[PDB]
């Protein structure tokens, strides 16, 4: 290779506080990378990306567990590539070393030979060993994200034999130039956390919009519908968006004070614990329903007395032009007499006119710092929604969709993990036989996408599996079809 | 110069992949930089800015062409400055070296003495040589944006001389210059060069109506502001407003016909059948913007089976139901249009009887627009490009714009960065290659000039080609064009 | 490579004889007379990088005697040397060529690679005559790649970017291939330790060292080149032996327009003239699109004249006069009859409205010539009134065989009662206006293009751009390119030979 030898730990020996050691049995065995599975099929053209890495301590699950009590790292790692072919095949492969700070859209196979490369045949027997060295700009890497040295593997000549696919594995162990740098109290710094997904089956996740359970996932019928839900919106760093509450006993709730004028009878909106509502950036009080273009039916009760009568009194809210909850004022009608304070929940909806149809894929017009919409991205990636049984009269369906469940939002808020990639990769896993049922992507804005089969998506999967985080991938990572 | 000796690649030899040598003949002659030209004038005051350059490999057209092959760079340069004045213009200048990390955003002429500086007169014959050193904090410089050293030229004493003083800046590298990591050439976007297309003026298409550019002119009242919505594209390639890419998408309307009790209408979609989203764009891409008039759109029906006469002329009035931001217009026509209608604006007419049509206004979409274009002062005016178009009862029969469509389609394709406050353009006759005028190209996407008294750019031939010259500052004074 | 686990089925090293040519001195000659001698990067001198003309296929459709690749000795055989060649002027020295071949353990065949001296110019060197040059006969089953020195036989002290003959490598098939199969071969080059560029020149100014590029525009943003509309589909024709001779949208890769091809995307299908009206009827005396007079020359018509033949035209014009009152437009109806002769600059029309003076208009919609005929959008009009006049049309386009098919670009356009309601072309207008500005030289017989998805940067199909200005493909059985997504980007990959076997596109 045209690479000069680099030095790992002699530059950061004098200017850092400490230089710490590593258990010598980690330096010897080769441990498989997180995304270290790739196949080569005869349907592949020359030029397809097969794998893609970048240098760090996350390429080895011992270094990732050791780095949570340290502060810096330097050094080079060693990579193995192991193919599985026999003596009756033909084809080549290319593995190039892209330097840090190089940004480009696509690299052809003619431009891939201008990097320091290794062109390896398919029929090889001993595994290919490639040095992955550290080309630094500073003395030592601290615990932030910063672009590092990449490997890039592409097909070079197409595969010919005589559905024979060829499977490959990537294995990685550090060189003796690897070192950690400063003893820190473990798992306290935010920069060394890792994102995790709760260990709860799908038939025990609550809905994030109505108070019911999730029973089956679908994809929408339209494949480019744009959704702008305001309940169940939260990014991966634990920043709530819209009117998303935290717990699951706060979804689709209403608390306010009743005023009685000659104009009608209405509600002055407060929050769900007695604090007065502030109109700074929230479109509504935290816990307000977002079912748009319908007629709500909220059943409340009287709060601060020793009640002797029948407390429950249904209230009917119509989404006309006086409906403006952003100012903290909705108008209702009823058959009982609700006075004072009323804490209630949304029971069921109704259409506006006498013959209209309730479309639960829409949001009301509040009157103002809304949540941003969700466009369906990439190549064939479809946003997976979660349906739930809820009483909707005179509608096309009885299923209410969402993007994330409530126990995901209540976990992302407490966890406060950072984002180390451009997307996440999940694995739907049966909890009995531990077999992988399908893979999904988790984007940094909080919506799960997938690539479905023709005529079948995630709805064909059973409803008692458990999501499991795997690793961080790029945005253009290819998924497998589900169905 | 009061500066320590600064080493080159001796620090970056350890932690980089390669260290690469260059030609020993580049370090001998002084070549004019692509950011060289500046002017001194008695309009200036002691304390202005004549040029400012950040240290890099883009200060020399040999190092710029070499840096598309490499990744990093380390080392110093040498700068040499020429002036051209008589023995009747008295005054000094001052060229100082501001280190990186010094942030004050205003430097008095008494504070610029406290840097490493060269104080030079304007009556000098031999040029002035000053070394620009690479004071840095890191081991080497990756081809991206980090603060490097600055040259900074100010007027140090008032100029008692329309006489301007031309100046040029010539650079050559020191013997300590070195590039670092070989990549494939011309793949990164960060080391690209801005070009202007090599087309004559009469072979350029208009950007507001479907016609060809006839001549250039300036306005009569040169303090009128314009807010055109087609032909708006910044130099980095970001489209603004409703500007389309190609030249066959200009002033075209496509939508589905709906009938109601009050006339007919069109439910607007995009220009290929894709549904329109009411977002950041004020209209579907390619919507016309000739305001305060009545349109005449001639459409046909997108259908495989047509008979008789497939054309229909829709007359759109800009009354209160004209609201293209919501996604609906109205029309009146004597034919019977149905289904998906696609058409192009044909001619415009006055709104009421006796009134006249103004082609400089824009319609009212609302009942997220592009920012207005203000003239940048210093006795300049905006160059407009005129084109013949059928206009009844108007002042002129010609429609202006701010950029040709090929310029927009070139800036979108190239995506070159911006290294200056303006771009100086020449206008050359393509036979004898003489020069006819100087124009500035601002990074907001419009071309200005300084018109002569009694004339302007409308007295020039109409077959000249624009040629990129250099990157200049905001106060470069242009020679007046005209007669 | 893979000599470890390939068994002993294939040979590993090509046993070759030394070539019958003496070694050639390098850059020591141009030290006394040239101005400068410029050193280059030592990291280039020992890395084998794939040449731009570095792809070929050996398919069992090839006969013995087909040209696989053909290289002229220059600095354009290496992308580092090509990118350095735009800065300097002149060069000397030798190169080092390396050919990669890896078939199965089942295939069979041989190739022959010969060195032709400068000045020996002949067409169709056979495989009998290629033996008489210094040659190496290599197998198609070897593992270690063949290395061939490309010496620099010359008459003068050093070279220059003008037109002079240089040495050639010429690799042809020798015995037929015997096994759905091809053999992907790659050619990799590296300079000798005697290579040297000579004189510094302003970079990327001269024409002879340029590089052909294709625009970075998606498919749905390209304009049609025969009617004013946008491209929305790529199809192939049914009759694969139908000849097409279009007039608009014809441009060679060197950037030299043919026929009535305009430059801008707003000049297509336009007519400008001054209306005369005798006692017989009404007509137009044709001028150019900017008022300049039109003379009978190499073009058969003014630039931008429409070319949909054997039909009726409906053109909607307007007066060029400033003072307009009332209804400005006027629809003209043209028949392709005997008084239709745009080569002499006169047509004849009828209209309900009355336009006079100067008129400028655009073709609106077409119509059949008779009450029960059809509209074929694949024909062209007869420009000359008498058929024997030399009107200097563009030459017809023939498909180059090997199962290939020409790609057409369709657009929605109001055709009344035709075969389909779409108009084809050969090149988009943004390709013509990009080929005219660049003026890049052509270094092969085709240009392999890839149709790339703009987001995931995948690969959807291979295409070939021929130097006469059209794009071909090999359609799959019962499919074609009309199944592809309509927002891809054509990227340039390599310069290939005329007999490159593409992969079938579509389903």
Automatic annotation (TrEMBL), chain C:
It comes from the Viruses. Gene3D superfamilies: 2.60.120.20, Positive stranded ssRNA viruses. Coiled coil: none annotated. GO terms for cellular component: host cell cytoplasm; virion component. Residues 1-274 form the Calicivirus coat protein domain. It is found in: Host cytoplasm; Virion. Residues 286-507 form the Calicivirus coat protein C-terminal domain. It holds the Pfam family Calici_coat_C. This is Major capsid protein.
